[PDB]
Structure formats: structure tokens, C-alpha cells
Amino acid sequence: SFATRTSLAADLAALGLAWGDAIMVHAAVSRVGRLLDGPDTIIAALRDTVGPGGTVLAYADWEARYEDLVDDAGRVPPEWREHVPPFDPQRSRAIRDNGVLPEFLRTTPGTLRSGNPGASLVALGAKAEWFTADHPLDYGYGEGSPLAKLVEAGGKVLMLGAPLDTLTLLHHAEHLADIPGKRIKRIEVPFATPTGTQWRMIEEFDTGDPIVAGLAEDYFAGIVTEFLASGQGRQGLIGAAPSVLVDAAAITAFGVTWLEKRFGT
Amino acid sequence: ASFATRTSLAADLAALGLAWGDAIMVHAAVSRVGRLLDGPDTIIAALRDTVGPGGTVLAYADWEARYEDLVDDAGRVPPEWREHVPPFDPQRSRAIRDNGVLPEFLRTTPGTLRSGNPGASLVALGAKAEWFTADHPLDYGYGEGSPLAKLVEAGGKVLMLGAPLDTLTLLHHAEHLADIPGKRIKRIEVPFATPTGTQWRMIEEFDTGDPIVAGLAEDYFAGIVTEFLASGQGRQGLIGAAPSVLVDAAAITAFGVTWLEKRFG
Numbered sequence: 001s002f003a004t005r006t007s008l009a010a011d012l013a014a015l016g017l018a019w020g021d022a023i024m025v026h027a028a029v030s031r032v033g034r035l036l037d038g039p040d041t042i043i044a045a046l047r048d049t050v051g052p053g054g055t056v057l058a059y060a061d062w063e064a065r066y067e068d069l070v071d072d073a074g075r076v077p078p079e080w081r082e083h084v085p086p087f088d089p090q091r092s093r094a095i096r097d098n099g100v101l102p103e104f105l106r107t108t109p110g111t112l113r114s115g116n117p118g119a120s121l122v123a124l125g126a127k128a129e130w131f132t133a134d135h136p137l138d139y140g141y142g143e144g145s146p147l148a149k150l151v152e153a154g155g156k157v158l159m160l161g162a163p164l165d166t167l168t169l170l171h172h173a174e175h176l177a178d179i180p181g182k183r184i185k186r187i188e189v190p191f192a193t194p195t196g197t198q199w200r201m202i203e204e205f206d207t208g209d210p211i212v213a214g215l216a217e218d219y220f221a222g223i224v225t226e227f228l229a230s231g232q233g234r235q236g237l238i239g240a241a242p243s244v245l246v247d248a249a250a251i252t253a254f255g256v257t258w259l260e261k262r263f264g265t
Numbered sequence: 266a267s268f269a270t271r272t273s274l275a276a277d278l279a280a281l282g283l284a285w286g287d288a289i290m291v292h293a294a295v296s297r298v299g300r301l302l303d304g305p306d307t308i309i310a311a312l313r314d315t316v317g318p319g320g321t322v323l324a325y326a327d328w329e330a331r332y333e334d335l336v337d338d339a340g341r342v343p344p345e346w347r348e349h350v351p352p353f354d355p356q357r358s359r360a361i362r363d364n365g366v367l368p369e370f371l372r373t374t375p376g377t378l379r380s381g382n383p384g385a386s387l388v389a390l391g392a393k394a395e396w397f398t399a400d401h402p403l404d405y406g407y408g409e410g411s412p413l414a415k416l417v418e419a420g421g422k423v424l425m426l427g428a429p430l431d432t433l434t435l436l437h438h439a440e441h442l443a444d445i446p447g448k449r450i451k452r453i454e455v456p457f458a459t460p461t462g463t464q465w466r467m468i469e470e471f472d473t474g475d476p477i478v479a480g481l482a483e484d485y486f487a488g489i490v491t492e493f494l495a496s497g498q499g500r501q502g503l504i505g506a507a508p509s510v511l512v513d514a515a516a517i518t519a520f521g522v523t524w525l526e527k528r529f530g
């Protein structure tokens with residue numbers, strides 16, 4: 001049978017999602033079961049559960065398919081530059097590699113989208129403007145980023161059936177961790193401007209593979225599983241989906257400690 | 266792989282016979298097109314570039330209407346479910362994604378309009394978008410005065426861009442027009458969003474979920490299209506990597522009516 005916006009809100013409240021929360025969601029929509037409005041049922045239920053003073057967020061990123069073309073310095077070959085679609089935070093699609101919910105949130109009326117393309121978040125609700133403002137273009141998973149703001153605001157992250165290694169916030173722990181050997185990525189990015197396309201080199205720690213050597217690609221999942229084993233966070237069903245709800249500040253500190261124990265001096 | 270671009274796709278579309286000023290309805294299987302530098306949006310952009318500002322780009326939106334699984338044998342929603350069913354909102358309801366994401370991506374392109382009969386709804390973007398989407402009759406929404414009838418009246422075109430040939434929605438307008446006996450009729454209750462809340466209405470139309478009459482294969486539209494091509498009409502060729510078929514809307518409609526009337530008839 002169908003789960004509804006009402007039934008999902010009951011499940012979310014039971015799992016610990018609280019009135020006024022800033023909630024970042026990662027979802028595997030099919031695992032939730034039958035939904036009367038599909039992915040939009042999830043968005044509506046989240047909004048119902050945090051209420052008007054809460055904020056609903058997701059990781060947008062952008063497709064940036066031209067990245068396959070760049071040279072070893074990260075630059076776009078001259079013959080391709082004119083063809084590459086520039087980033088526009090109001091128009092560029094969210095990436096769909098981990099389901100359609102971020103794109104569906106992006107196109108829900110009222111949603112705002114932050115300005116660092118590959119690190120961009122979407123936000124809908126009371127603090128959406130603040131969460132998406134002034135996203136630094138370099139090291140966009142670090143200080144002053146939407147992820148840093150989620151920690152500062154005491155926000156939460158919900159894995160709604162999503163694979164645990166897709167918890168984007170742990171890239172903020174990677175950025176913060178005092179460990180050596182961090183992998184740095186440099187890539188040229190085109191930005192839409194009223195005066196035309198402006199290209200800029202972006203530098204950040206790589207988030208496409210673990211920040212340091214010796215880790216499997218899915219190592220974030222193990223960090224989350226250890227966090228839960230330590231007695232932190234909450235687990236329960238949302239619809240039919242096994243789900244995990246964690247405090248943003250708590251999981252970030254745990255991930256920093258996890259990395260510093262294994263790679264620090 | 267190489268990347269197709271909005272420039273290269275526009276060249277392919279012009280080569281296939283798409284013309285400046287055309288009203289073009291597109292059905293697309295994005296995966297058949299090969300690598301696209303801006304994904305499905307490359308296709309939309311190339312279509313707009315080829316027809317220009319005086320042209321119009323259309324697609325079949327429909328809507329998910331998942332509650333249809335709940336209706337009783339007269340098509341009505343049982344009382345315990347009525348409050349939970351998301352109402353149709355032409356500006357908000359997703360396009361159905363059964364035949365790919367392009368209609369939904371077109372729907373969320375700035376400026377696109379969406380017609381008011383949910384299950385028969387078209388999206389339209391361009392010079393005649395208001396006319397194409399206005400006053401869509403709620404009963405028999407594939408018939409007179411519908412966006413599909415208007416496409417025929419305007420001398421528009423239909424492009425199967427890698428799409429299976431039996432997904433040519435316009436041939437449901439031929440089914441509506443054909444003077445044949447035994448036509449199957451569908452009745453279903455539909456909720457509409459309004460300023461004062463949900464308003465329910467019974468909709469009646471010829472059933473477009475199965476062939477209009479008994480004795481036809483489920484994919485019989487595909488055979489009509491290939492017979493149309495075999496008669497010397499229409500154009501065939503690649504768009505990007507995708508085998509594609511471009512037909513005149515008025516011509517394929519008359520052909521399909523004649524095809525049905527010859528047989529049933």
C-alpha cells in the first residue's frame with residue numbers, strides 16, 4: 001500500500017527529526033516503498049516534520065560532463081571551451097548520480113542553490129538564503145561552506161535508504177582533519193555571467209576518491225556504522241526504507257577523530 | 266562517444282528536415298543519443314536553436330497519478346484516500362517519466378507552459394506556447410480543441426528522437442477521430458488544485474492506455490509509423506547517435522485515421 005506525506009512525517013518524527021531542524025537528506029527513493037507523490041512525497045513530509053522554521057537541504061553538485069575532456073592541469077582544450085555549458089546556480093541541473101531527489105528539490109518553488117557548482121547544496125525553508133549564500137569557490141567543503149553552516153546551525157543529516165558512503169558532510173570532516181598527504185584537485189570551471197562565460201580555476205581537496213590513501217571508496221559507510229555502534233545517532237524505518245539520522249556536528253567531529261587517529265602523527 | 270553538443274545536434278536536426286519556425290513535438294530516449302555535453306538539456310537547446318524564436322518546442326507531459334491504483338470500478342477515489350491524493354497543479358505536477366526525463370526537463374525550463382488536462386497534458390516552450398496549452402478540454406482531451414489538434418492545425422511536426430515508435434502520442438488523436446465501432450472509453454476521478462482547496466471532477470476520454478479497439482497489438486502505433494514511412498512520407502536519420510523519425514503532424518494523423526477506418530472500419 002501507499003505511504004503518504006502524513007505517514008512519512010510520523011515516521012520522521014519517531015526517528016527523531018525535530019521542529020525547526022535544518023535537515024539535509026540523501027535518499028534512495030525506491031527503498032521507501034510506494035509513495036502517492038513519488039519523490040515529492042518525501043520532500044513534503046520533511047517540510048511537514050520540521051515545520052516552517054526548519055530548512056530542507058540536499059546535495060546538488062552539477063553534471064559537468066566536460067570534465068572528461070580536461071588536460072592534466074584541469075584545463076578545457078581551446079576547441080571545446082565554446083561548447084561547454086556554463087554554471088548558473090538558478091538553471092544548472094543537480095546531478096542525478098544518487099537519485100532524483102536533489103533535482104526535484106532544486107525545482108520545488110522557493111528552493112535556493114549555492115554558488116560553488118560541484119559542492120553546491122539546495123535549501124528550502126527558513127534559513128535557505130543563509131545556507132546558500134557566499135559559498136567559497138575554492139575549498140568549498142571547508143570553512144564558510146553550506147556544510148560548515150549545517151554544523152554551526154546544529155543541523156542533521158538523514159540517510160533515507162541511501163548508501164551510507166553518500167553522506168556528503170563527511171567531506172567536511174576530510175577538509176578539517178589535521179592529517180598529511182591530502183589529495184588536492186584543480187579543475188577549470190565555466191561560470192555564467194551577464195557579460196558572458198567566465199572561466200576560473202577551482203582548487204579543493206578531492207571528493208571523488210578518499211582524501212588520503214589506504215581507504216576503500218566507500219569508507220564513509222564504515223565511519224557511519226562505527227558512529228552508530230558508539231551509541232550515537234538514530235536508526236529506524238521511514239516508509240519501507242531503513243534510515244539513519246545523525247547530528248551534523250557530532251558526525252563531523254567523529255569523522256575528524258576517525259581520520260586523525262589513522263593518519264595523524 | 267564523442268560529445269554531441271547543442272551545435273552538432275542542431276546541425277543534425279536541420280539535416281533531418283526540422284525547419285526555422287516549426288512547432289516541433291519531441292519524444293526522446295536520451296540514452297540512444299550517446300554522450301551529450303549538457304545531457305537532456307542539450308536536446309532542448311538544439312531544438313530551440315533550430316526552430317528559432319518563432320518556433321515552439323513541445324513534449325508529452327502526462328502526470329504520474331499514482332492514486333489511479335486506488336480508484337474503485339467507477340473510477341472514484343475511496344473516501345479514506347481523498348484527503349491524501351496530491352491534486353493536479355499544471356505549474357507544479359511532475360511530468361510522467363515512463364518514457365524518459367525530457368518532458369520533465371522541458372517542463373522545468375524557464376518559460377515552458379503546461380496544459381490543463383493532467384493525463385493528456387503537453388508542455389510547450391516558444392512563440393505559440395500559450396495558444397498550444399490554453400483551454401485544454403478535460404473530457405476527450407485527445408480530441409477537438411486539444412493541444413494535439415492544435416499541432417495538426419498549425420502544421421506542426423513530431424520527432425521520434427531515439428524513442429520507440431509506438432510512443433507517438435499524436436496517434437491517440439487519430440484514434441479519437443477515427444469513425445470506427447467498439448472504441449474503449451475510460452472514466453476516472455481527478456483532483457485539481459485551486460485557491461480554496463482540492464476540487465474533484467470526473468474525466469471521460471477514449472482509453473489511451475491500450476489500443477482504441479480490440480484486435481490490435483499493444484505496439485500497433487509502431488506499425489502505423491513504419492507503414493507511413495514505407496509510403497514515402499516522413500524523414501529518417503541520426504540525431505546525435507540516435508535513430509530518429511520526423512513526421513508531419515497533419516499527414517501522420519490523416520494516415521492513422523485512414524489506417525484505422527480501413528480495418529474496423
Ligand SMILES: [Cl-]
Nearest residue numbers: 029038039100
Ligand atoms: Cl522516482
Ligand SMILES: [Cl-]
Nearest residue numbers: 292325364432
Ligand atoms: Cl512520452
